[PDB]
Amino acid sequence: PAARFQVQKHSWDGLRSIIHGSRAPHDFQFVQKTGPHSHRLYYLGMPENSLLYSEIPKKLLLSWKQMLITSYDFHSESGLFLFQASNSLFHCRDVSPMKPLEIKTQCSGPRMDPKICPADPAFFSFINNSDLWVANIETGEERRLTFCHQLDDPKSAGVATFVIQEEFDRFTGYWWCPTASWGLKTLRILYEEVDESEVEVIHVPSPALEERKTDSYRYPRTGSKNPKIALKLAEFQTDSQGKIVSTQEKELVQPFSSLFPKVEYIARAGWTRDGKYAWAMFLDRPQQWLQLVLLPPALFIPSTENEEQRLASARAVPRNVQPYVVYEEVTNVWINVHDIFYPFPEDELCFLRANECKTGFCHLYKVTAVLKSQGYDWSEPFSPEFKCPIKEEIALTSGEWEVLARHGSKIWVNEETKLVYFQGTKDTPLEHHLYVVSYEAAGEIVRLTTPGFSHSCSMSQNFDMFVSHYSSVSTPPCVHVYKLSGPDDDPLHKQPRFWASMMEADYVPPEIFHFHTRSDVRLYGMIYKPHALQPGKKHPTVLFVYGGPQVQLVNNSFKGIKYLRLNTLASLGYAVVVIDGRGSCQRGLRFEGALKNQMGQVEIEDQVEGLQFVAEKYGFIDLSRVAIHGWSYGGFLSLMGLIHKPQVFKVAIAGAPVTVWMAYDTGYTERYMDVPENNQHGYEAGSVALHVEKLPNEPNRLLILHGFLDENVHFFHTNFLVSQLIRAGKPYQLQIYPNERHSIRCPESGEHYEVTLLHFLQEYLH
Amino acid sequence: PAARFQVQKHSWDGLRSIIHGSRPHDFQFVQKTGPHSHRLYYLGMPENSLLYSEIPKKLLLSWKQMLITSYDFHSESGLFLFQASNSLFHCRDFMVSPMKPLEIKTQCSGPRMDPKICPADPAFFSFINNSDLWVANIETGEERRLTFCHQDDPKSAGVATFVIQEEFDRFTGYWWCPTASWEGSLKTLRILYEEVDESEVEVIHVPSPALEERKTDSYRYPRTGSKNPKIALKLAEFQTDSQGKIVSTQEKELVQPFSSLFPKVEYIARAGWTRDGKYAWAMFLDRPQQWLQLVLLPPALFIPSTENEEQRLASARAVPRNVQPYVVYEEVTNVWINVHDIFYPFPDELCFLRANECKTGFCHLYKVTAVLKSQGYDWSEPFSPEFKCPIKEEIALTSGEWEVLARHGSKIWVNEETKLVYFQGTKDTPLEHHLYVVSYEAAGEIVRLTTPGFSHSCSMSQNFDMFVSHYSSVSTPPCVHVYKLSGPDDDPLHKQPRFWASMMEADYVPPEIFHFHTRSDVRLYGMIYKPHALQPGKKHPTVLFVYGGPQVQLVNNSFKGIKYLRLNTLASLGYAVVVIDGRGSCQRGLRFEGALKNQMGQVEIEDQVEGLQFVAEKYGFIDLSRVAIHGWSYGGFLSLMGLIHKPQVFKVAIAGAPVTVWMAYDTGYTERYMDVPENNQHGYEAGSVALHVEKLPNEPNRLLILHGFLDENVHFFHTNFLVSQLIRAGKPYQLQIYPNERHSIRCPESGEHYEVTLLHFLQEYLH
């Protein structure tokens, strides 16, 4: 009877008194001294996120020396720092602090995407009004290279399109060539042509509500056309006085569309160390194919509107020269883009490659391809091809665990010692650890980071130092510094000794658990226990959710910062439960591949099963009083829960829900759900706005939160749901966040979000 | 103890079951020359369409079919020009079977707005295509453009802009000349039109109807304070062969600019021509809207147009020195000018009729005689203003504490044979629109023609031998009776209206009208719906419905059941529904309406509170501890002021489509009443509810915000900005969107939801 625990009710000022009561170093660069200190670490920090440093001794908490910013570019030899601070451009070279030298300009608009020329630090680049610009920090001489820009000005150059930034995690459309050819010189830049003419335009309202205007995004929805892309060279010569004597636009000797048919997106691109070949990863529209291709500079002829003077150049391209397809990946699930690709320094290329499609788990391979120069008439056109034969493909790691290559995880390769350092899950899926392996000999795989914590690491250029940014479910986050030390004749077994420390430590942490499904698959989970529990009492329960691809909620690292509100929920007597269902990240391709063409359907069984296991193991779950809650995919799932499982889920608080997959973009949806023409059944099944008939008849069971300015998940989603709820005659409550986009950035808006949530549960979880 | 009526708590599906369970005009008299005396032509809906009745020589009239909201008619040729679907249609008339409408094709790409038949020649008509004036010929099929302002692209022609359409209730900006000239030494045909340069006007984005497409529409929306579009009057002439072909054409412009001849002229409220064709008249208006004045523009005042400024001087010299514009009438006020559209000119002088509220305080007719004597002007040179004619006489044909209906497409009907003027008014009572007659020669005996004890919407025959009245009362449903003026021909004033025939005929319990006096001794009217099956003793919970803003009068003697069925539904669950006409309302004169001048929100709620307190004492069934306030546009704005300045009175507040920010609203409305924000900053701030959000309730479930997402008028921005400021002040709110609704909820599905949300919200939280 009174066995079940009623949550203490509160006035609204009470609840926002409760919530108001509630309320790290990165981008490291190691450099040696050559005195008392061995190196100097450069990094970003926020003790306002500015540039800082520390001093590493020869013989303890390192102090944070001020030097003077989301990012910056560094150059080893010259010691040049180049960053986008203010709404302007700044630099400085490197005991006491120095104020940044401002780089004055003639162009109007911001200077996006600043990078320094590696081959010559006097030079550097930036975007301006969708075109590429060279400059010189010494002389101050600026100059435009691309000429695409002039509402219907579609062509752009050096820019990564909407879907490329948001769904392929790439934020530039240009890459410096790392060497020069010669008292004249020259410097090249690979860059990306983009005609966004075919792409559909969406209107979203801007920050300034007062002036009642909208911005004009190019938003390619699924089935609709993506932008038309191409690779290109942009050369420019210089004399000894640092003067841009001339420039050139360079198109491929044939079209990119006919050389490389079946290429839909440019996931990544770059250059070989020595500067010889340029490379790029190309993907197809299904995203079930990914070839990595070398493009020689001689393959690029100058651009001219004169067809005779082009055939002059198109005849002078050597017949031996061609693009080389060194690698190719193929799957029936989906090729996730893995950043890792390390070419070694001529009738063959040796490189490393992250490859999940082979065995099912991302692992490092050493691969040698063979560049059979094949003879081609490039003044004449044609179409298929360039798939080189593979000389060998030695597999350096294997098992049922991952090498981390996404989310800007990276490898580090010492060529002297023949060792490659990586990060992976080998020990557990709950902890990101730092491994080393030889690349000659796929031998034993030594770990450097101690278990019990999930680590986020960065190695020194000289492979002598490394930093780790680790944390556990219970303990707060530390940033320690380690120094690899031992006999040089045995480098694979260098012992990481604790050298120094940079960061250190009403919250009760959750405890992690696992269980098995009725189909015998291990799912990890997490639970916040009701604070000051009385064993015997069944408390009411909030099931927090995401359950979409590209994510892992449950893992062994500190949650108290981002998910403080789950602790707040638990401090008032709620049970907060979190389950990673089939579909979630970090446990291989098959596990995640559960989602394929079937979104919504597979994810709730695992969540229902999660709760019931929680309720048997732990003796405090009143299953009559359960609330499902989440944002984006989770808001989508909160509504699916309330449709598919109303017996289980009493209320639902759906934040930013994807309510119509057909209105969502290509990049995300096609990867997982195919094209609406091919997978109609699945698109309709997982569109919650087409199943509003099954939502509750009674009110107080469904709350909709949506940020008005949402660039990514458009307010249209909530607005089309309310549209359908009104037609179906179903009740709904609604909260709007007028100044918020996808995340709630403003503390005030967030306090209001959390207070509403508490009240809603308080009043109506009964 | 247990003497407070409890409303029965229904489930949501129960409440839908209850709400679901709840749910002739534009007349043209033409005589015949048999059994039937006339044929009455009109719009009607047994969709809305063209119909006719047969009025006999000697009972319920049949509705015959001709075959559409607005149509045009020409008497002699019997031409019916109308707009149907996304195209133009016509027909002519005596049929016995119905005739199909003949279709008129076009070479122009886009729809053809605003169709009007040339009065002088029925073969010709005109329309707008892409913000430019066109001209056509029904018989020959030949079209022909006349303006070239269109080709972002901000110059328009023959268009009334946003603020003019929705605040000055004018829906065309071109006017046909009623006569044809044969000048030279080819038959000419003029049109007066309004050129508009809406370049300097702010663009606002409003969501489009097709939600899937996720695109907006630009709207040239001039905020209060900011600039309106820049206007001008212009002459577009053309000529025709005796075979009926548009041979020549010509744009014309004033010999000096419009802006220089007429400084301080912010808006062209109205315009047209005198019946003979001599002068083109126009009502101008200033930015304060306190200086309206009538002007005549003689056709020789307009020279041709060329890009060459030397071709211009030549014909600027050519225009007769005597000719000019004559400022005939000048209304001035310390409150504001309401545009009264009544202006009847007759054939050295000009004699006209004109409605004038600014003179005595009540809209009354006058006979005015002005004197057009030319001063002699050198039109090659420029100048600054002057043109005010001296008045011969200004006889007043009506006077009292009651008014002549002039706004809202009301009108006068002037028989020039009998010297009588037929008008509508409030002479008997402010609660009843009645048809009156008076002589314009001898202003004495005002004879009422409509039955007392009801309120009437009327329309005279052009022959003044019979009229229609569409009438109703608070209790009885609406009727439409056809009356016939009948009696001795020697005394036309006392011709007796005899009932001739009827067109349309008449659990809802009607409301009771009452009045009471305020502590300052002003008479206010109000309604009440009693709770059905009342048990005296029980104190019921009360929904104070409201609007309160200008240009409206809710409380009057006429059938409310149609638009306020929800109010009766509320009553049938046991809610008292009270409605009070606060100070600042329509149809009580200028001084009554002028209690809002520069302090909007501050006076209305005090009158509403007194109306509640009176009704509680008068009737014994109002529980004052449980009172809800609710309304739309101004009403939702007020519902929030009630909750701000009277939380101790109002338990809850359901605010629909509210004006949360005066600075965001348009000029035409806001400035007229609140002035410009540079002058009256104290009152903009005081009556903008979004700046007083800190004073809303700390408790939840006391404030429900309703808003349609596609609101062209009261933009969603207002609710968005309110929600912004509630969030920032840490105040709860409930909220409801109507994604497919602009300003009035039009969809029945959306309206059924609106009402079930209203019943549920009150059911649960009105305690």
From Swiss-Prot, chain B:
It comes from the Eukaryota. GO terms for biological process: negative regulation of programmed cell death; proteolysis; pyroptotic inflammatory response. Ubiquitously expressed, with highest levels in liver, heart and muscle, and lowest levels in brain. It is an enzyme of class 3 (hydrolase). Its EC number is 3.4.14.5. Signal peptide: none annotated. The active site is at residues 633, 711, 743. Optimum pH is 7.5-8.5. Little activity below pH 6.5. It holds the Pfam family Peptidase_S9. Changing residue 505 to R: Reduced interaction with NLRP1 without affecting the peptidase activity. InterPro entries: AB_hydrolase_fold, Dpp_8/9_N, Peptidase_S9_cat, Peptidase_S9B_N, Serine_Prot_S9B/DPPIV. Inhibited by the serine proteinase inhibitor 4-(2-aminoethyl)benzenesulphonyl fluoride (AEBSF), and by di-isopropylfluorophosphate. Inhibited by Val-boroPro (Talabostat, PT-100), a non-selective inhibitor, which triggers pyroptosis in monocytes and macrophages. Val-boroPro inhibits activity by binding to the active site, mimicking a substrate-bound state, thereby displacing the C-terminal fragment of NLRP1, leading to activation of the NLRP1 inflammasome. Changing residue 60 to E: Reduced interaction with NLRP1 without affecting the peptidase activity. GO terms for cellular component: cell leading edge; cytosol; microtubule; nucleus. It catalyses: Release of an N-terminal dipeptide, Xaa-Yaa-|-Zaa-, from a polypeptide, preferentially when Yaa is Pro, provided Zaa is neither Pro nor hydroxyproline. Keywords: Acetylation, Aminopeptidase, Cytoplasm, Disease variant, Hydrolase, Nucleus, Protease, Serine protease. Val-boroPro binds at residue 633. One of its GO terms (molecular function) is aminopeptidase activity. SUPFAM superfamilies: alpha/beta-Hydrolases, DPP6 N-terminal domain-like. Belongs to the peptidase S9B family. DPPIV subfamily. Dipeptidyl peptidase that cleaves off N-terminal dipeptides from proteins having a Pro or Ala residue at position 2. Acts as a key inhibitor of caspase-1-dependent monocyte and macrophage pyroptosis in resting cells by preventing activation of NLRP1 and CARD8. Sequesters the cleaved C-terminal part of NLRP1 and CARD8, which respectively constitute the active part of the NLRP1 and CARD8 inflammasomes, in a ternary complex, thereby preventing their oligomerization and activation. It is linked to Hatipoglu immunodeficiency syndrome: An autosomal recessive immunologic disorder manifesting in infancy or early childhood, and characterized by failure to thrive, short stature, skin pigmentation abnormalities, pancytopenia, and susceptibility to recurrent infections. This is Dipeptidyl peptidase 9. It comes from Homo sapiens. The gene is DPP9.
